[PDB]
Design a protein around this motif. Structure first.
Motif, short mmCIF file in Angstrom:
data_model
loop_
_atom_site.label_atom_id
_atom_site.label_comp_id
_atom_site.label_asym_id
_atom_site.label_seq_id
_atom_site.Cartn_x
_atom_site.Cartn_y
_atom_site.Cartn_z
N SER A 31 0.80 -1.22 0.00
CA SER A 31 0.00 0.00 0.00
C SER A 31 0.85 1.29 0.00
O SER A 31 0.35 2.32 -0.42
CB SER A 31 -1.02 -0.01 1.14
OG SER A 31 -0.44 0.38 2.37
N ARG A 32 2.11 1.23 0.43
CA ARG A 32 3.02 2.40 0.45
C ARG A 32 4.08 2.37 -0.68
O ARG A 32 4.85 3.33 -0.81
CB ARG A 32 3.77 2.46 1.80
CG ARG A 32 2.86 2.74 2.99
CD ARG A 32 3.63 2.79 4.30
NE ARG A 32 4.52 3.95 4.37
CZ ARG A 32 4.87 4.56 5.50
NH1 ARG A 32 4.37 4.17 6.66
NH2 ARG A 32 5.68 5.62 5.46
N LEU A 75 -3.72 9.32 1.48
CA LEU A 75 -4.17 8.20 0.63
C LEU A 75 -4.58 8.80 -0.70
O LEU A 75 -5.53 9.61 -0.75
CB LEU A 75 -5.41 7.54 1.26
CG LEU A 75 -5.15 6.45 2.25
CD1 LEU A 75 -6.40 6.20 3.10
CD2 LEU A 75 -4.76 5.18 1.53
N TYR A 88 -5.60 2.79 -3.76
CA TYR A 88 -5.15 3.98 -3.05
C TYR A 88 -3.77 3.66 -2.50
O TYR A 88 -3.60 2.64 -1.82
CB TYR A 88 -6.07 4.34 -1.87
CG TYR A 88 -7.39 4.92 -2.30
CD1 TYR A 88 -7.53 6.28 -2.51
CD2 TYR A 88 -8.47 4.10 -2.56
CE1 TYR A 88 -8.74 6.82 -2.92
CE2 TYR A 88 -9.69 4.63 -2.96
CZ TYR A 88 -9.83 5.99 -3.14
OH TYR A 88 -11.07 6.47 -3.53
N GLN A 89 -2.79 4.51 -2.78
CA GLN A 89 -1.45 4.35 -2.19
C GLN A 89 -1.44 5.27 -0.96
O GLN A 89 -1.85 6.43 -1.06
CB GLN A 89 -0.32 4.71 -3.18
CG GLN A 89 1.07 4.64 -2.52
CD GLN A 89 2.18 4.57 -3.53
OE1 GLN A 89 2.05 3.90 -4.57
NE2 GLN A 89 3.32 5.25 -3.23
N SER A 90 -1.00 4.75 0.21
CA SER A 90 -0.97 5.55 1.44
C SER A 90 0.39 6.22 1.65
O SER A 90 1.39 5.84 1.01
CB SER A 90 -1.31 4.66 2.63
OG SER A 90 -0.35 3.62 2.79
#
Ligand SMILES: CCS(=O)(=O)c1ccc(OC)c(NC(=O)N2CCC[C@H](C(N)=O)C2)c1
Ligand SMILES: [Zn+2]
Length: 139
Positions: A31-32, A75, A88-90
């Motif tokens: 996610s990151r 996000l 969604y990239q956080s």
């Protein structure tokens, strides 16, 4: 391409991690878009511990550094690529500036140290994966 070297850690974009990074894995987060691997040699990079919203980043597709004003880590929706589905990239910070896919890994720095690395872009946009919240990089 590009990495951060701090203590016995190497920080790279997860989508560009090598077989050796995965074999010496410390932590990763899809996610990151971040992956951290262990190193035998001591790194000397400094990580910023601040709330700066201005800094300078290295752009390899121009062989130049550029100053940027960037949004706080948040996000943000990222279109599908060969590395990830649409998601969604956080912890991502967006700025106006030039970038191409191969620019991922370029360092963003403020007066306190390394803030993050290039991870996304767009038409006149550049996005950076924040690393200032990873306090364990220094211990
Ligand atoms: C026509 C190229 S562009 O759309 O402007 C552009 C400029 C710059 C770009 O990266 C700096 C991109 N590529 C990407 O943002 N990604 C591909 C690699 C994985 C990245 C991720 N963290 O999910 C997403 C596209
Ligand atoms: Zn700072």
């Amino acid at each position: 391409s590009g990495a951060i070297y701090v203590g016995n850690y190497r920080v790279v974009n997860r989508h560009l991690a090598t077989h050796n990074d995965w074999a010496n894995l410390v932590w990763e987060d899809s996610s990151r878009d971040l992956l951290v691997s262990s190193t035998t040699a001591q790194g000397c990079d400094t990580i910023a511990r601040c709330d700066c919203q201005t800094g300078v980043y290295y752009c390899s597709s121009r062989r130049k550094h550029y100053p940027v004003s960037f949004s706080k880590p948040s996000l943000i929706f990222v279109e599908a690529s060969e590395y990830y589905p649409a998601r969604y990239q956080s912890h991502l910070m967006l700025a106006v500036g030039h970038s191409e896919p191969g620019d991922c890994g370029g360092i963003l720095r403020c007066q306190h140290g390394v803030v993050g690395i290039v991870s996304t872009g767009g038409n006149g946009l550049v996005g950076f994966a924040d690393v200032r919240d990873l306090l364990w990089l220094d211990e």
